[PDB]
Amino acid sequence: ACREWLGGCSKDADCCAALECRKKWPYHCVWDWTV
Numbered sequence: 001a002c003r004e005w006l007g008g009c010s011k012d013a014d015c016c017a018a019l020e021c022r023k024k025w026p027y028h029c030v031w032d033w034t035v
Contacts, residue, residue, distance in 0.1 A: 003029050 002016040003009070007029050012021035019029035 005029055005031060 004016050005019060005028075007015065009015060009021040009027045009029060014032070015021060015029040018031060018033045020032040022028055022030050
């Protein structure tokens with residue numbers, strides 16, 4: 001499985017989908033398409 005929203009950043013390639021690797025604390029997948 002991949003890390004969903006608020007899931008720990010493993011990669012910045014969405015990590016799951018439509019997300020990004022947070023570049024600021026806390027470092028977990030946040031929705032990119034929501035900005």
